[PDB]
Amino acid sequence: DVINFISEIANGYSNLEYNLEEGKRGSRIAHIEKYLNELTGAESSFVVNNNAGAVFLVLNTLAEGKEVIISRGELVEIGGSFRIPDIMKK
């Protein structure tokens, strides 16, 4: 069901960054978010490439140059190149 919906939107042009209502460019992240806030119950949402970057982005966004407290048992290494300590540093 999903593979076909993707198949269709990729076959040609789509309203990716276009809001059909106002006829001017629009945020592509806007289509989904409606779903997320409803399912999660959160106030707003957003999505990026992967969770690796999701972390990276939250950290550089809210704690660049400032301290972040985390348990010494939660400094994981998931995957071959991901490590909470190595990325948070970056």
Next chain:
Amino acid sequence: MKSLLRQIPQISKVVEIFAKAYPEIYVVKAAREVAEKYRKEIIEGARADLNGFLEDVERKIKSLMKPNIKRVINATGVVINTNLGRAPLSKDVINFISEIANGYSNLEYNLEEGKRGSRIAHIEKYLNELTGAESSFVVNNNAGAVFLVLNTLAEGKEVIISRGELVEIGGSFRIPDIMKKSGAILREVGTTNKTKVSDYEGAINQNTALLMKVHKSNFYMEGFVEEVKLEDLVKLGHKYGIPTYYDAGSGLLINLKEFGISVDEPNFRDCISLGIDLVSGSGDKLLGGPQAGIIVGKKNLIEKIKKNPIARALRIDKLTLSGLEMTLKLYFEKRYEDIPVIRMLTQDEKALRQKAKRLEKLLKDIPGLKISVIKDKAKPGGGSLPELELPTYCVAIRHDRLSSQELSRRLRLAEPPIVCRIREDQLLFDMRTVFHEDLKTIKKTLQELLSI
């Protein structure tokens, strides 16, 4: 309200009420303790009656005449029970200790030269032989063993250790909290679940005075988890000229596979013959002896540790020293079955059921008892072997009148007190840890609680 308290009798009066009833000393102590509990309960206005007084005062006396610390029958099936006093001692050892404590001894006296001598000298001979290390030493416990090695060799300098090995064993011990107090600077490498060799070699520098690895004794990690082999750390040390210090913790003196139990638990002899410069561990864990911090390794290091002015505040007492030598003597003589901890874990599966049913035969008569023997898989090691899971026969019991919860509670109040597992409202007794002379004590306790 100042008359609801004037009431309470006088200690002179109560002492009378117990002329020959109980020693006058114990009577007054219980009266005081009791007299205070009634003055406060009446001042806060929580008591309107004082009749409970007489009955209670006598209960304190019955209690106060009994020491706080008391032998307890362990039915949990956990050999290294941190709570119940870890490794119990063979009578052979208990007697050798008994003898040296009865009077004076050559503790710090060398009979040869007739002048004072180091008390640590009696044992060390044993250690260097069993481990194969160049020199050895022992202190109060392994907690301090670590503390001493760190303040001795890395005060003010860096010590590299895996981020997955910064453990918290016990309630107050934490590698990070003590090393800090140790004066050593902590350099944690790798990540929780994984740590390659690159991580170690990457953090070395001018200040790196020590490469330390701790053995995850009271916990384990499964799933994506990587660890740095010991041979690698030795190689790493010898390349940069840095010492290697292993805190085994378990204090396993020998290869464990030789007894049928297949585990990767590390041991002194092997760890030392591996190229490790220093190794430590508790005596009351996998060694089966009294509490003691044991250190073995290169001579030049041992000498450095001994000279430390702090070693005198950790030097072991007369009891554990002797008791340690007799436990070491047993190991040279290959008297393995004589040390409790070892015998309990290497007991025949056959052996266990044999005791499982000899107990059930003792409880068939007692009223209301639902007796059954089940074969379950538990984890024997409490403070030294986290992963080990070995089969053992438990005699699961159940009475119609009282509930399993209430059951465990009265059993801990018995004399002697018995501690056992609870699983699904059914009391269980693992025979892995039960001594034979307890079986008779078990039956006499149960029939005295259900029929009285």
Next chain:
RNA sequence: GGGAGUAGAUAGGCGCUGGUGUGCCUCCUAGACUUCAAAUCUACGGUCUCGCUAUUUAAGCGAGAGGUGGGUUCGAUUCCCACAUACUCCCG
């Protein structure tokens, strides 16, 4: 025993709804229709209590209770919270 999940009616079993509750099934009864059965159809229907008239009772009338309490709200059966209780799952 400690955790956690599921939960709840105002006739009874299953489900839903911030508009003063509601849908499917059942029971009952009532009624209609039937030679019969069956089928079918219909019901601001139904408990409890209290107060009022009648007062054997009915019968009528009025009010309220959704485990209990509280809060938000214009409105709470819904939402939130707290407690209690029932069913189930994880641990000692």
